[PDB]
Amino acid sequence: GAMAPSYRVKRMDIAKNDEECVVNAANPRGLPGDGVCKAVYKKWPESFKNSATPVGTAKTVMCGTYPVIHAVGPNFSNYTESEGDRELAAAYREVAKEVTRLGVNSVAIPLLSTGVYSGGKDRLTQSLNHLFTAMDSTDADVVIYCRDKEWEKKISEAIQMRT
């Protein structure tokens, strides 16, 4: 466990994190993919051996001793808002189980389904709240990654609101 479990946000490439494991914003087929998934493939390609897993689940594959937790959010181009919301909440609960099982003291996590899976919508709040629902009961230090300056400010504000 971390001494004083916390949330933080950083605006940078999650492939350059300083945490004990990474959550990939994976596709269901374990393909190199786009966005976060492509940066994770470049940095940890060994972790895509048998990484394919269904929507709403997470599958961990070791790169050396470094855990890559492949978390598959729904593509809101394909899902209804209602079923999409259910699967996005489920993917984060599976992330919390894996982070707990691994016994890490820190984890780097992106906002699932906010990129090319967002179906053209701003899902910062929806995705972040499902992240909190899942990770609040874990004692790992959580570091949320983003790339947009206005997203960094909104994520930071949401963290500070609860403190």
- The residue range among 38-46, 77-85, 112-120, 125-133 that interacts with Cl ion, by the rule CB under 5 A, is 112-120
Name the minimum Å distance from CB 82 to Cl ion.
Answer: 19
Q: Is 50 annotated to bind ligand?
A: no
The dihedral built from the CA positions of residue 63, 44, 109 and 32, taken in this order, carries a sign that is: negative
CB nearer to Cl ion: pick between 4 and 149: 149
- Nearest-CB residue to Cl ion? 115
Q: Is 117 in the site for Cl ion (CB under 5 A)?
A: yes
CB nearer to Cl ion: pick between 27 and 47: 27
Q: Residue 98 contacts by C-beta under 8 Å, 6 or more apart in sequence?
A: 58, 60, 67, 69
Name the minimum Å distance from CB 27 to Cl ion.
Answer: 9
Residue 40 has φ and ψ, to the nearest 5°, of -65, -40
Contact 23, 69 (CB under 8 A): yes
Q: Is 146 in the site for Cl ion (CB under 5 A)?
A: yes
Name the minimum Å distance from CB 150 to Cl ion.
Answer: 9
Residue 56 carries which side chain, given as an amino acid letter? Answer: G
Angle at 25 between CA 124 and CA 28, to 5 degrees: 125
Q: Residues in the site for Cl ion, rule: CB under 5 A?
A: 12-13, 115, 117, 146-148, 151
Residues annotated within the binding site for ADP-D-ribose are 13, 27, 35, 115-117
